[PDB]
């Protein structure tokens, strides 16, 4: 009795960590006197940010 099946919504599988693969970022902070000036932030924050 071939009546097909519910298939209305896509089903998905994801990494153990949720997110999956990532890249390394340095922080930056803005120069306040400029409209578009930035300066690295290596103060209390890590240089290897995920």
């Amino acid at each position, epitope marked *: 009795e071939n009546h097909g099946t519910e298939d209305e919504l896509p089903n998905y599988c994801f990494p153990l960590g949720g997110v999956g693969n990532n890249s390394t970022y340095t922080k930056v902070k803005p120069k306040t006197g400029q409209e*578009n000036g930035w300066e690295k932030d290596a103060t209390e924050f890590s240089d290897k940010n995920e």
Partner: single-chain antibody, 227 residues
Framework: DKDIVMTQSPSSLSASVGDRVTITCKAS??????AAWYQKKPGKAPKLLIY???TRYTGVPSRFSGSGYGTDFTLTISSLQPEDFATYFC?????????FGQGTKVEIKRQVQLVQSGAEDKKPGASVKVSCKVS????????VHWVRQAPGQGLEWMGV???????DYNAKFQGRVTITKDDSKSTVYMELSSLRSEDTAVYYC???????????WGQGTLVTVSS
């Protein structure tokens, strides 16, 4: 939350035809490589010389040059001429509140447009509104500053309205300043309140680059206040 004070020495200089000239600026705190040098004629708005403590603007002669880093910076004229006898300004665009120095005096030895409103005067304990009609650029793309010079004193930065419509003020003056703008008749407005004799000054419209020091200026509006 600490003030960026530009202390310019020596205050005056006296010079003759073909002379080598040197001015030095000492900042309160580090501003890194971002420091700007200006030349100003008495009544007329500044002209940009040096930026990034060594780079020349478009049409700046070969005889002007800068040097220095961190807190100390120097402005040098290789071999001076009568055109160069004006009053000079140290400046930093590194952090907003933007600041200028005291303004030194070199004296003899014996397309983008900013048009402001007409001059005027009023009595202490009132309020004034000055205009700056803009042309040759969109106010959404570039924030607009306000500067003023009290008679024969330094340059006092009043405020800025940044490209999104965010205002930013020199909190030292108690928040007397209010900057507005109209995208539809492309104008920026400066409205000042609780007027006193110490506020008598020429009031200047100004604009930055992409992200480099102030370079496009109004004609100035003389506001006089007498007791």
């Amino acid at each position: 939350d600490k003030d960026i004070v530009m202390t310019q020495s020596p205050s005056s200089l006296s010079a003759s035809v073909g002379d080598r000239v040197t001015i030095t600026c000492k900042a309160s705190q580090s501003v890194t490589n971002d420091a700007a040098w200006y030349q100003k004629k008495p009544g007329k708005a500044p002209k940009l010389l040096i930026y990034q403590a060594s780079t020349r603007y478009t049409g700046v002669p070969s005889r002007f040059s800068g040097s220095g880093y961190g807190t100390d910076f120097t402005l040098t004229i290789s071999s001076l001429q009568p055109e160069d006898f004006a009053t000079y300004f140290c400046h930093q665009d590194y952090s907003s509140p933007l600041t200028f120095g005291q303004g030194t005096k070199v004296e003899i030895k014996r397309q983008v447009q900013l048009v402001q409103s007409g001059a005027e005067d009023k009595k202490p304990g009132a309020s004034v509104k000055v205009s700056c009609k803009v042309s040759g650029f969109s106010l959404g793309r570039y924030g607009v500053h306000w500067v003023r010079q009290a008679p024969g004193q330094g340059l006092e930065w009043m405020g800025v309205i940044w490209r999104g419509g965010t205002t930013d003020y020199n909190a030292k003056f108690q928040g007397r300043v209010t900057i507005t703008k109209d995208d539809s008749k492309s104008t920026v407005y400066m409205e000042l309140s609780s007027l006193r004799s110490e506020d008598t000054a020429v009031y200047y419209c100004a604009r930055q680059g992409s992200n480099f020091p102030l370079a496009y200026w109004g004609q100035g509006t003389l506001v006089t206040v007498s007791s």
